Amino acid sequence: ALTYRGVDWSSVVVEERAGVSYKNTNGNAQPLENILAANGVNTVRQRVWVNPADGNYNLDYNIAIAKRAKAAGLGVYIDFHYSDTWADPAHQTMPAGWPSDIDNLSWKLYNYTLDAANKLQNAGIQPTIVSIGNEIRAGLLWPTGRTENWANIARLLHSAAWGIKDSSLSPKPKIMIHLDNGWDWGTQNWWYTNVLKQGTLELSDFDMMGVSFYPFYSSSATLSALKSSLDNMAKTWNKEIAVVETNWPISCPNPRYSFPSDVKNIPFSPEGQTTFITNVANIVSSVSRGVGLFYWEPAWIHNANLGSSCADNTMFSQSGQALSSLSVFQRI
Numbered sequence: 001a002l003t004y005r006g007v008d009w010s011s012v013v014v015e016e017r018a019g020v021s022y023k024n025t026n027g028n029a030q031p032l033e034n035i036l037a038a039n040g041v042n043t044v045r046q047r048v049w050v051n052p053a054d055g056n057y058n059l060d061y062n063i064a065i066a067k068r069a070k071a072a073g074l075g076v077y078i079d080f081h082y083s084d085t086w087a088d089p090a091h092q093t094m095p096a097g098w099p100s101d102i103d104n105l106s107w108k109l110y111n112y113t114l115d116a117a118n119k120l121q122n123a124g125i126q127p128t129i130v131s132i133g134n135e136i137r138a139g140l141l142w143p144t145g146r147t148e149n150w151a152n153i154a155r156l157l158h159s160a161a162w163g164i165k166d167s168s169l170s171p172k173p174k175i176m177i178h179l180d181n182g183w184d185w186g187t188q189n190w191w192y193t194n195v196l197k198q199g200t201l202e203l204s205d206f207d208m209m210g211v212s213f214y215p216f217y218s219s220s221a222t223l224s225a226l227k228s229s230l231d232n233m234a235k236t237w238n239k240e241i242a243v244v245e246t247n248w249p250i251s252c253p254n255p256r257y258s259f260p261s262d263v264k265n266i267p268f269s270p271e272g273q274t275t276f277i278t279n280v281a282n283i284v285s286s287v288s289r290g291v292g293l294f295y296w297e298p299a300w301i302h303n304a305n306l307g308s309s310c311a312d313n314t315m316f317s318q319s320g321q322a323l324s325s326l327s328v329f330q331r332i
C-alpha cells in the first residue's frame with residue numbers, strides 16, 4: 001500500500017568508519033544498502049548539513065552514500081536541515097557565513113538549494129523526495145525565520161522550493177515540508193494556516209507534508225491522535241502525507257515520559273517493533289494520500305538510544321546484525 005517504505009540511514013558511513021560490519025539476518029556480512037533492500041526498504045532518507053566542520057552529512061558525504069543507495073535500487077529522500085548541525089524545533093542554527101537580513105538570507109537559501117540540487121543532478125542523483133528544512137515547527141534559520149515571523153518563514157520556504165524547481169534535477173523531486181509531533185493537530189493546523197496566509201508560499205509550491213511520530217516524548221502521541229491529525233491535514237490541504245521519522249524500542253528501562261495508552265501493550269522487543277511499525281504504517285495508509293513511513297536510524301548501533309530516554313531503538317544487534325524486525329518493510 002505505502003509508496004515509500006524507508007529508513008534514515010544517514011549514519012551509515014560514520015558507523016562503517018567506526019568499525020561496524022553490517023550483517024544480514026542470516027548472519028553474513030553484506031553492505032547495509034543491500035540488507036535494507038533485501039528487507040523491503042525502497043527509499044532511504046539522508047540528512048544534509050551545510051558546512052559541518054568534520055564533514056559528516058555534508059553534500060559530498062550524501063552524494064557518496066546516495067550513489068550506493070542508487071546502486072542498490074533504493075530511492076533517495078534528501079532532508080535539508082539548512083544548518084551546519086542538527087536542526088529541530090529547539091535548534092535552527094544559521095549556517096556559518098549566511099546573512100541574517102531576510103532579503104539576502106532568502107537569496108542565499110535559494111542559491112544554496114539550487115546549487116545543491118544541480119550538484120546532485122550532476123552526480124546522477126535525482127531524489128524522489130526533498131524536504132526544505134527538518135522539523136521546522138518553530139521556523140528555520142533563526143532568528144530570521146523563527147516563529148512567529150510567518151512572513152519571513154513563508155518567504156524563505158518559497159525561495160527554497162523554487163531553488164529546487166529552477167534546478168536541473170530531472171525528474172524533479174517531490175517537495176516536502178516537515179513538522180514534528182504529527183499527532184498534534186492543533187500545532188499542525190496553526191503552523192500551516194499562518195504560513196500559507198502570507199501569500200508568498202502557495203499550496204502549489206510544495207507536494208508533501210511530513211511528520212515525525214515518536215512514542216516516548218509524550219503520552220499524547222497515541223495512534224488515534226495520529227490518525228485524527230493526519231485525516232485533518234489530508235482533508236484541509238489534500239497533500240501527500242508521510243511519517244518521516246519514527247522509532248520503537250527493543251529496550252526502554254526508564255522512560256522520561258509515560259507511553260501512549262494505545263501502545264502500552266506492545267512489548268519492547270523486535271516483535272514489538274514489527275507490531276508498532278506495521279500499525280503506524282497502516283494508520284498512514286488509512287489516510288487520504290498517506291504514502292510513506294520512514295524509521296529513523298535503525299542501524300546506528302553506537303547511538304542506540306537515538307537521542308531518546310529509551311535505551312535501544314535500533315533494529316540491528318550490537319554486533320551489526322539486522323534483527324528480525326527489519327523484514328517488516330516487506331509487509332507494509
Ligand SMILES: *[C@@H]1O[C@H](CO)[C@@H](O)[C@H](O)[C@H]1NC(C)=O
Binds near residue numbers: 104105107108111
Ligand atoms: C546568489 O547567487 C547570485 C548568482 O550567483 C549572486 O549574484 C548573489 O550574490 C547570491 N546571493 C547571495 C546572498 O549569496
